[PDB]
Each structure stands twice: as structure tokens, then as C-alpha cells.
Amino acid sequence: ISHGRVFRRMGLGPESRIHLLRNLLTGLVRHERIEAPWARVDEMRGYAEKLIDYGKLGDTNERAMRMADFWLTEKDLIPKLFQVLAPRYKDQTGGYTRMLQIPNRSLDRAKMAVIEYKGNCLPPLPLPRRDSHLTLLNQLLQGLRQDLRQSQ
């Protein structure tokens, strides 16, 4: 039984799992993109968002700083987190982290995934579009909407 039970069981224990998560987070901070196995990626994203929120609170808060220290192993990244990422997302609330599939990893045939903080500096991912508005069904829908508007 495992009803209402968040947190997947990643490494060789919970500490290990946490460590793994941290590494991923660090990588993300460094890079602003990671190819990683999809099951851990979501966890990372969850943690990542929280981390960014924490960073937003500002350098001067000690708790936040401590958290940053804990989670960013490479240490140069803490300034980046404070003096860049936070600045970038001051307007947003929790839209950060964009998480999409990758075909499949070649050797073990795992489910894979990408994880970028939103916007960022790298070439854009080939995102899944919605169908264009000029298509038949869409056009019909638009017409219907117009009619409704006219009625009211």
C-alpha cells in the first residue's frame, strides 16, 4: 500500500535520493538545460521551483542563503541564483521550469526529459504547438463564438 504518498524512491535511500536531486539542480543552475531520466526530472523541477522561490526572498535573508549553500554544491552558482535567476522571474509567480520528453536513452531505453528554466540563453526547444487558428474546425469554432457574441 502507498496511498497519498509523494516522493519517488530514487537512490540507495532518502539521503542518496536528495543528493541525486541536488546534483541535478546544480547542473540545471550551471547550464539552464539537462537531459535526464523523466522520473527524477519531475522531482528536480518541483525542487527547482521551490529553490527559485527561496532565491527570490533575497541574499540578505539568512535562511535562504543557507538553503542555497546546501543545494548549490558548486558555490559560484549561489550568486547566479541571487543576481540572475531571481531577477529574471520577479514578474512571474511559479511559471519557471519547462519540462518535455526526449525520444528515449539509447542503452537502457529509459524515458528521458529536458528541464530548462524558462526563457534562458540557449537555442529554443522544438515545442509542441497547438493547431493554427486558420484551420477548418478552428474557423468553425471562431464563427460560433462570433455568433454567440452577436446574440449577447
Binding site: 540572475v84 518535455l100 525520444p103 529554443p124 522544438p126
Partner: protein
């Protein structure tokens, strides 16, 4: 425990040629509207994703070159300029970076 008699070939066929064990004929597959190389729904196009990855790698290399050793990570949002903080590539811009 040990098999008391040899499993007959007919039986075996029935067991292992049954529709639960046969590979399903999937219907996720659509054409890649840019690039045309064919891809799954819910997944990034493999070919389309490849170019992007390559681009990232080259940009990464350039970044590395710029930032001498490890432990740098500066306080500027970087930009990638091709031919007219800054990272200076080369070539024309592709028909997707904008």
C-alpha cells in the same frame, strides 16, 4: 520443484503467441510538421531535437573558452550573437533561433 513432463510445442505456441505477449501496434506517430522526419505525440522530434542539442553544445564550448577555468558563473544574462553579456559564434542564424 521440477517439471514433471516436457511442455508440448503446441502448448508453448499457444502460451507465447497470444495477444498479450504480441507487440502492440501503436498510433502515437505523426509527421514532424517542420523537418518531416516523423515523431511520437507527447515527445520532441528526435531529429529536430538533435540540431538544437548540437547548437547548445557549440555554445557551451564557446562559453567554456570564454570562461578560462572552472568556478566562474558570472552575474550577466548571456546572449548568443552569430554574425552581427555576448557569446560570439559565426555562420548565419538558423531558421528557428530568434
Amino acid at each position: 520443484a521440477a517439471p514433471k513432463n516436457r511442455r508440448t510445442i503446441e502448448v508453448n505456441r499457444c502460451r507465447r503467441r497470444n495477444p498479450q505477449k504480441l507487440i502492440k501496434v501503436k498510433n502515437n506517430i505523426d509527421v514532424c510538421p517542420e523537418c518531416g522526419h516523423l515523431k511520437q505525440k507527447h515527445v520532441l522530434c528526435a531529429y529536430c531535437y538533435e540540431k538544437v542539442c548540437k547548437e547548445t553544445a557549440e555554445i557551451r564550448r564557446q562559453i567554456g573558452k570564454q570562461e578560462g577555468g572552472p568556478f566562474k558563473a558570472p552575474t550577466i544574462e548571456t546572449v548568443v550573437l552569430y554574425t552581427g553579456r555576448i557569446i560570439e559564434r559565426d555562420r548565419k542564424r538558423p531558421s528557428w533561433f530568434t
